[PDB]
Design a protein around this ligand. Structure first.
Ligand SMILES: Nc1ncnc2c1ncn2[C@@H]1O[C@H](COP(=O)(O)OP(=O)(O)CP(=O)(O)O)[C@@H](O)[C@H]1O
Ligand SMILES: [Mg+2]
Length: 416
């Protein structure tokens, strides 16, 4: 997607200060980084700069959603400075702010090979452009203030590099507001985009897409677009029940149901048929008397229906077989969302078996792409991240792409 945009590999950073937007918005538990995949995924771009004789490297990102309110005790990027220092083996200068005189002078003529990490960009309402004040009232940013903020960020360097794929879908100040003669996309951006371009412009055939999750309404455009590129599609998780109900008139008990999505199901099937797309739905399920990790377990099939008062939380053995059948024929796979409540061991077996199949397919030459989010965390708790072709570092961003949208984060990049 950047074949028409400027990239790091085509930039000259010798003796220059580099302002690099990155995505260090990692998850925490109480004071520790539960997952540092996002930090490690940006190192390749940081080193390339340093190894190429860079005067300095200024990194900026956000953490959570403070709403433009300084919350150092809740969303401080300080702990990320400690984590980075160890992964880089180099010293990192952390600043209590990301804009202002003090920061601006600190980033002017610094000691060569200097790594500087700025503070949460969202501690200012100028980043997103909106937020709230102490009074609790929702406020809007001033065009004059926005220009100032964007102007301060631009003074931090000579060239600008964007490697925040996970934030590529946001049209915030640090993503599209930096005013510098050169805006280059990082390696992480080049890598992530290269995989999704393969599964969006010219995939290997057969091409299979596995879509799970809970709701259907917020997935309509994702399915609609994918129905123009895939050969086979698996509809699993709570999503399936909305299709079985409208398509087979099957009873679903107290299982998840999407009223809004139920009205489009028939239009989705019609599009698949016209395009020659095979849609695999589950044939049996693992039920529960209630929504609880320690609920009573049962079983059911499409033909028998789900008993009243019960609900399907995972697929069954026969469904696992069909899924594997589709996985075996594929030459490329895109997976987004679990096919069952994987957070509870008793209902994660269906997702576990599919992962095993997906892992075996990769070792046979199949291109396997797992979209970030709930389906990304799985592989982590399974240590099967290096058992597939690619695990995305951006769920909401990769979703935007799959829907066929344009990420403001890359469009704002310099042309070539
Ligand atoms: N058969 C099923 N019944 C109920 N929940 C299911 C399910 N199959 C999957 N899920 C749940 O679906 C969730 C993923 O759904 P989805 O991708 O829509 O979530 P989301 O993060 O966009 C917001 P929400 O989960 O609130 O809808 C997982 O947390 C998983 O436990
Ligand atoms: Mg959702």
């Amino acid at each position: 997607s950047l074949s028409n945009k400027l990239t790091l590999d085509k930039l000259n950073v010798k003796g220059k200060r580099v302002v690099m937007r990155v995505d260090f918005n990692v998850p925490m538990k109480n004071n520790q980084i539960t997952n540092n995949q996002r930090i490690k995924a940006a190192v390749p771009s940081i080193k390339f700069c340093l190894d190429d004789g860079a005067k300095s490297v200024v990194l900026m990102s956000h953490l959570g959603r403070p709403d433009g309110s300084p919350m150092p005790d809740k969303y401080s990027l300080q702990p990320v400075a400690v984590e980075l220092k160890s992964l880089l083996g180099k010293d990192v200068l952390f600043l209590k702010d990301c804009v202002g005189p003090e920061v601006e002078k600190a980033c002017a003529d610094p000691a060569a090979g200097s790594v500087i990490l700025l503070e949460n960009l969202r501690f200012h309402v100028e980043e997103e452009g909106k937020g709230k004040d102490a009074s609790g009232n929702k406020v809007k940013a001033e065009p004059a203030k926005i220009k100032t903020f964007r102007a301060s960020l631009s003074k931090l360097g000579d060239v600008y590099v964007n490697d925040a794929f996970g934030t590529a879908h946001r049209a915030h100040s640090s993503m599209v507001g930096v005013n510098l003669p050169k805006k280059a996309g990082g390696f992480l951006m080049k890598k992530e985009l290269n995989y999704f371009a393969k599964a969006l412009e010219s995939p290997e055939r057969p091409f299979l897409a596995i879509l799970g999750g809970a709701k259907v309404a917020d997935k309509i455009q994702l399915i609609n677009n994918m129905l123009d590129k895939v050969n086979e599609m698996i509809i699993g998780g709570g999503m399936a029940f909305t299709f079985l109900k409208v398509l087979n008139n099957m009873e679903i008990g107290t299982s998840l149901f999407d009223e809004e999505g139920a009205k489009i199901v028939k239009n989705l099937m019609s599009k698949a048929e016209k395009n020659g797309v095979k849609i695999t739905l589950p044939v049996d399920f693992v039920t529960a008397d209630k929504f609880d990790e320690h609920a009573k377990t049962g079983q059911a099939t499409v033909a028998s229906g789900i008993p009243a008062g019960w609900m399907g939380l995972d697929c069954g053995p026969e469904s696992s077989k069909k899924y594997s059948e589709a996985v075996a024929r594929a030459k490329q796979i895109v997976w987004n969302g679990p096919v069952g409540v994987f957070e509870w061991e008793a209902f994660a077996q269906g997702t576990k078996a599919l992962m095993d199949e997906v892992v075996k397919a990769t070792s046979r030459g199949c291109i396997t792409i797992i979209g970030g989010g709930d389906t990304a965390t799985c592989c982590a708790k399974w240590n099967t991240e290096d058992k597939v072709s690619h695990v995305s570092t951006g769920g909401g961003a990769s979703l935007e792409l799959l829907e066929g949208k344009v990420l403001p984060g890359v469009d704002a990049l310099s042309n070539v």
